[PDB]
Amino acid sequence: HNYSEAEIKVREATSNDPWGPSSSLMSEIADLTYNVVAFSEIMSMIWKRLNDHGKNWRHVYKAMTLMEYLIKTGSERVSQQCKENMYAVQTLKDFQYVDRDGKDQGVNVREKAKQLVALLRDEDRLREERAHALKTKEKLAQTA
């Protein structure tokens, strides 16, 4: 069918464009993770966007950025499902992409993957990361 609004938001937040996802858009997606229907659509689209290679690395990098944000500020179900699909996060630590100009863009995906896995496996730390992230999200909504 047509994409749901939640799916459209995830695709925009992970678009193959030279700009990272805005905090405002990620915050909207985070709220939608509490919606039982939207949650599954959101997660599925993120896993799909992470499934890419080489020159399409921005899809992957931005999808990881969004996943990190949702792990920290969305429903606790996000982190739960990421832990259950840990392998799919771990594989990204080996992603490679050096462009035609010889510049290593893939090292960025590898670095973010490494720190994303650490965030998911360090259980005591996740509690503190969520508290700080949620406070940051609250301030975002209370500022222009």
Check whether 125 is labelled as a binding-site residue: no
Domains of the chain from N-terminus onward: 1-144 (1.25.40.90)
CA separation for the pair 35, 5 (Å, rounded): 12
Check whether 56 is labelled as a binding-site residue: no
For helices 5-13 and 23-32, angle between their N-to-C axes, nearest 10 degrees: 140
Can you tell me which residue has the tokens 């990272």?
Answer: 20
Entry resolution in angstroms?
1.6
CA separation for the pair 7, 89 (Å, rounded): 20
Method: X-ray
CA separation for the pair 87, 8 (Å, rounded): 26
CA separation for the pair 97, 79 (Å, rounded): 27
Output DSSP code: residue 52.
-
3-state secondary structure of 22: coil
Backbone angles phi, psi at 98, to 5 degrees: -115, 120
Residues 6 or more apart from 30 whose CB is under 8 A from it? 69, 70, 73, 74, 137
Check whether 59 is labelled as a binding-site residue: yes
Check whether 49 is labelled as a binding-site residue: yes
